[PDB]
Design an enzyme around this catalytic site. Structure first.
Site, PDB file in Angstrom:
ATOM      1  CG  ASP A  54     -43.005 -27.847  33.302  1.00  0.00           C
ATOM      2  OD1 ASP A  54     -42.364 -28.649  32.521  1.00  0.00           O
ATOM      3  OD2 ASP A  54     -44.188 -27.455  33.095  1.00  0.00           O
ATOM      4  N   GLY A  93     -34.965 -21.973  49.058  1.00  0.00           N
ATOM      5  CA  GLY A  93     -34.588 -22.698  50.235  1.00  0.00           C
ATOM      6  C   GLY A  93     -34.618 -21.791  51.467  1.00  0.00           C
ATOM      7  CD  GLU A  96     -36.147 -18.323  42.398  1.00  0.00           C
ATOM      8  OE1 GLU A  96     -36.363 -18.629  41.204  1.00  0.00           O
ATOM      9  OE2 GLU A  96     -35.382 -18.974  43.186  1.00  0.00           O
TER      10      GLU A  96
END
Ligand SMILES: [Mg+2]
Lengths: 276, 276, 270
Positions: free
Chosen positions: C143, C168, C191
């Site tokens: 999204d 990452g 997150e």
């Protein structure tokens, strides 16, 4: 003096800002405003700077930035699959490969920057935004969906992690911009706004949201700081309880102080693992 | 009769949606769908609206939006340094400069909007995304990396700060979209979703995350609200303790209430300073 | 074998990477690096994968990805209103309709993807960013202003809500990528970083921030997990109080465990 006379044009134009618009401004005033923005864009000038150990805000540069809105019309910008409509040009619109090579930073699609912001060598702009009047010093990583707001001063070797926002301050003219000093790490989803100054080599973890009203609780001393993160502060999200104990409200918590120094991301992650 | 004829075409189409495909749709149905998207795009129609102090959702417009998907194939969209592939055209792809100029708003690159969302005069779309069916009224700021989801209704003189998401609502057809009423401020990193209604003149701080899943605790009364932020609420994040106090869980807290109206960010700043 | 040979060329190159620059990189070295990135881009190879039910991380693939930066110069990239300057090619720059039709995902402008990440069929990238070495499996939603970081593995039928970042993990070189297993919902503004593994069928609420240091508190057992969201966990933000109760600090709280509809799962907070 050449610079004194430039400032003169700006201070004079601003006093009469109410009557300045794109179609009436004289060529001298336009070129002067545009020259300032050009000097900001190359970092020759900067909106705030650290002088004799204190952050000084140059009001007349904020005047110049404000005037740059007032004297330029919105224009259509071709965007390939879309079109835009704005009055602040794009920093790189004109950059050629030679200029990029010489300045030594990286701009990763779809990262963009408004003309009038300084980006220094060894910076990496991941997709992110840098607004006008900003200054992004050498070695700094701006991660995906991060934002460096207007006039913010980002020091050297700073890490703005993903979705981190550094709030713009344009008005009031007298108000300092948000300032993140050299070697600071700012973790994912954090926001530092409203001219908060994060002193050098602080380590702010994820989701820490700090404006001028935010309580920064020093758990070692029991002290509540406002508006300034002491150099080497390791800061994390927390709450303080109501007198009741029946609820608690957000704050930032200083949970470790470390020596202020350039740190890798791996290093930062390892230091954050070192907290009680 | 024209609007009745339109609604009837959409609802009749939507009844047999399972048998409608891009290849097989007749041009009357295609034209009616695309015309309704055009009416939503221009704000002539809107997915929900306030009538008599009451927010009404029009199911049929949601059905139009859903059928707009169903009847269009994805297509390659050229994007200069990249290419895209989707079936919802871009609001501004066909906008000329005259159109931008008369509609009175600004679109700051790389901000984009899907066709079928309305953007009113004097608003500023910083890099951001506005999804199909949304309505963003006059004098609103949509700040960097913010999102106005499908069918969202954003009021006049609203400030959606950086990283703010206003959650989309299509299905269920019956569900009111996410509503931000006039003169609201929403702080950076916040999300309001799932047809939550933030009533007028409210100030939500940073890091506030509100869905139908979220306790909204009025620390003045000790009452929990769900799904609605009452007008003039000043809201910050906090947590409520478990019965035994071993842990606490996130909630939004209404820390005080103000009398809703036209604002400045002197008063937003100052409202939060009085917070406890 | 050819794959064993490829891995040896990459590892040998990694060993003397300090000698290697865009200026002096040799064609054997270049070809091998670039070939690994091509294979990652098509999903023929993937940085980590679940083998015999556990995740295996292919360090040499990480070395290839890392090397692909070292051995390439930045190039100007024309971007209509702006220009870029970077050394990683854009995945879709040369796609045509037939290839999009074949690979069967959607790419919503201004969504972009670096070359060397795999997008599977029936996935929808809303405006977002997918970085090099990522693998995003079928029927997944990414999204608006989500981010799928370098090497991150996103499973099938996953929902990455608006503003969701998956961290990452190129370095440290040894670490597994951030992993979102099959059938997971991740709430907006959340997150998940640093190799955390969110196991299948979990539901993570809004504004949840989990790195390797994040306490994931199981309010039922009193357990505290690190680095792993157990399968079918329903997870929200919370705080854990200090001993003396003077303050509290952020955590995640597993507020229920479900087998394998979200809002009802979340609308229960106690
Ligand atoms: Mg573009």
């Amino acid at each position: 003096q050449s610079m004194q006379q430039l400032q003169n044009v700006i201070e004079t134009a601003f006093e009469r800002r109410a009557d300045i618009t794109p179609a009436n401004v004289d060529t001298v005033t336009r070129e002067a405003i545009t020259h300032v923005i050009d000097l900001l864009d190359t970092g020759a000038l900067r909106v705030a700077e650290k002088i004799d150990g204190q952050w000084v805000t140059h009001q007349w540069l904020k005047k110049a930035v404000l005037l740059s809105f007032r004297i330029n019309d919105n224009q259509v910008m071709e965007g390939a699959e879309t079109r835009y409509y704005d009055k602040v040009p794009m920093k790189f619109a004109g950059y050629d490969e030679a200029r990029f090579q010489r300045e030594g930073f990286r701009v990763v699609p779809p990262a963009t920057v408004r003309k009038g912001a300084f980006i220094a060598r060894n910076t990496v702009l991941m997709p992110s935004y840098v607004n006008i009047g900003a200054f992004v010093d050498e070695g700094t990583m701006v991660d995906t969906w991060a934002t460096v707001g207007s006039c913010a001063q980002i020091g050297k070797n700073v890490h703005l992690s993903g979705g981190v926002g550094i709030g713009g301050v344009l008005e009031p003219l007298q108000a300092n911009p948000t300032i993140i000093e050299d070697n600071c790490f700012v973790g994912a989803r954090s926001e530092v706004v409203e001219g908060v100054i994060v002193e050098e080599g602080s380590v702010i973890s994820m989701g820490v949201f700090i404006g001028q009203s935010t309580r920064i609780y020093d758990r070692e001393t029991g002290e509540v700081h406002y508006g300034r993160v002491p150099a080497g502060s390791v800061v994390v999200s927390g709450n303080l309880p109501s007198k009741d104990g029946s609820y608690s409200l957000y704050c930032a918590v200083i949970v470790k102080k470390v020596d202020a120094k350039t740190r890798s991301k791996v290093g930062i992650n390892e230091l954050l693992r070192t907290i009680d």
